Amino acid sequence: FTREDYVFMAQLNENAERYDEMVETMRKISGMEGELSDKERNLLSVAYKNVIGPRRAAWRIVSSIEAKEKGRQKPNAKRIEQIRVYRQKIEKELSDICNDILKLLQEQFVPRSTNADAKVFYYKMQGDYYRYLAEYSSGEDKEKIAGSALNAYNSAFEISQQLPPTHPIRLGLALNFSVFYYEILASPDRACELARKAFDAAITDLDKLTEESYKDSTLIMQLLRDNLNLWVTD
C-alpha cells in the first residue's frame, strides 16, 4: 500500500463518513516523506473537524441540560452528579483529539512546511484546536490556552498577508480569528474590525482572482458578512 493508495482510503473513509478511521488513514500519511499536498492538507482538516464536531456538539447539549436541571425548583442531586460525570467524559474525549493533532502541528507539520499557503493552514489549525479547548476550560487554564491560540492566529495572520486577499485560507483564517475574539475573548470591536478588514480586502481583489475558487472564497465571505451583520450591535 503506497501513499497514493492511502489518499484514496482517506477519500473512501470520508465518502463513507467514517472519520475516526480517516484520522488514522491520515496519520498513516503524516509519517511519510515530504510535506502534505493541498489535497492531503484538506483531508487532514476534514478528518479532525468531523471527529471533533460531534463531541463539540455533545458537550454543548450536555452543558445545557446540566444547566436546566440545576435551575429546577426542586433539583435532584444524583442526576446533576451523573450528568456532570458524563460532561467530563466527553471533555476527556475532546482534549485527546485536540492534543493528538496539536502535537502533530507542533512536532510534524509546522516545522516541515516551507510555502506560506501551507504555513497559514497549520497555524490556523493550531488556533482552531486551541480555541476548541478554550470552549470548555475553566478561567485560569483557559487564559493560558487563549494565549496559545492568539499566537497561532497571529502567526497565521502575519504570514497570510503574502496570500491574495481572496485566498480561501486567508479568508478562512480571518473568519475563525474574528470568531476567536468574539467567542473566547469578549472583544466584539476587535472581531468586527478584523472581519471588515478581510471582507473589504477581498472586495478589492475580487476582480483579480476567484476564477474557480469562487465557490470556496465566496462562501466564506458570505460567512464574514453574516457575522458582521450580527455583531454591529456593538
Binding site: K49, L171, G172, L173, L175, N176, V179, I220, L223
Partner: peptide, 4 residues
C-alpha cells in the same frame, strides 16, 4: 459560524 467558522470556516468549514
Amino acid at each position: 459560524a467558522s470556516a468549514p
